[PDB]
Structure 1
Amino acid sequence: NYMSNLPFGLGYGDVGKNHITEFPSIPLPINGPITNKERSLAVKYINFGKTVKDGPFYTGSMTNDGIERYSDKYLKKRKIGISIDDHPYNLNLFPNELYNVMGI
């Protein structure tokens, strides 16, 4: 009746609970102490990515009132972004279908 299949090395107390640990736990030693070089790697890492996001290479974006406040008149523009076509590139490395988006 499937209740009597027990190896001699296996007891009765352990079985029945099951349910496993929610996440398997093996502390990896790659989380050691930080040094000045590691902090510098982190700093240069955060400068990177930030540079490419403050640059023109976002292509990620998917108060919008049809009426303009007088405060919005003679007010500073947010930022005149350099368009993807505005920055020069090499035609020999881009496909023909990608030429139209660029400014020839």
Structure 2
Amino acid sequence: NYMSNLPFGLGYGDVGKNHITEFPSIPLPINGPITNKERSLAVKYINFGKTVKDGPFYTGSMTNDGIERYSDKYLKKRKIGISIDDHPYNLNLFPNELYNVMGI
């Protein structure tokens, strides 16, 4: 009846609960104590990527009121973003389809 099938080494208490661990657990040893070198590596990681995002290499972007407040008149501009076409590049590394976007 599918219930008499049991190996001799196996028990009856262990079966029937099932479920299993929500996430399999084996504590990895690559989480060891920090060093000064590793902290500085985290720091330089932080400066990098932030460097490219503060640069013009984002291409990810997808109070916008039609009336201009007198405060917004003669107010400091946010930032003149350096355009993708503005940055000088080498033509020979880039395709012909990609030439029309750069300011030649």
Shorter-normalised TM range: over 0.9
User: Could you say which structure has the higher helix fraction?
Assistant: 1
Report the alpha carbon displacement of residue 79 of structure 1 after superposing the two structures with TM: 0.3
Deviations 1:23-70 (A, max 9, x none): 000000000000100000000000000000000000010000000000
CA distance in 2, matches of 1:91, 1:74: 40
CA distance in 2, matches of 1:6, 1:63: 71
CA distance in 1, matches of 2:26, 2:103: 55
1:46 counterpart residue number: 46
Identity %: 100
Give structure 2 stretches of 5+ with no counterpart: none
Q: Please report the TM-score for the alignment, with normalisation by the length of structure 1.
A: 0.99
RMSD over equivalenced CA pairs, Å: 0.3
* Stretches (4+) displaced over 6 A: none
Deviations 1:64-85 (A, max 9, x none): 0000000000000000000000
2:96 counterpart residue number: 96
Report the alpha carbon displacement of residue 99 of structure 1 after superposing the two structures with TM: 0.3
Give structure 1 stretches of 5+ with no counterpart: none
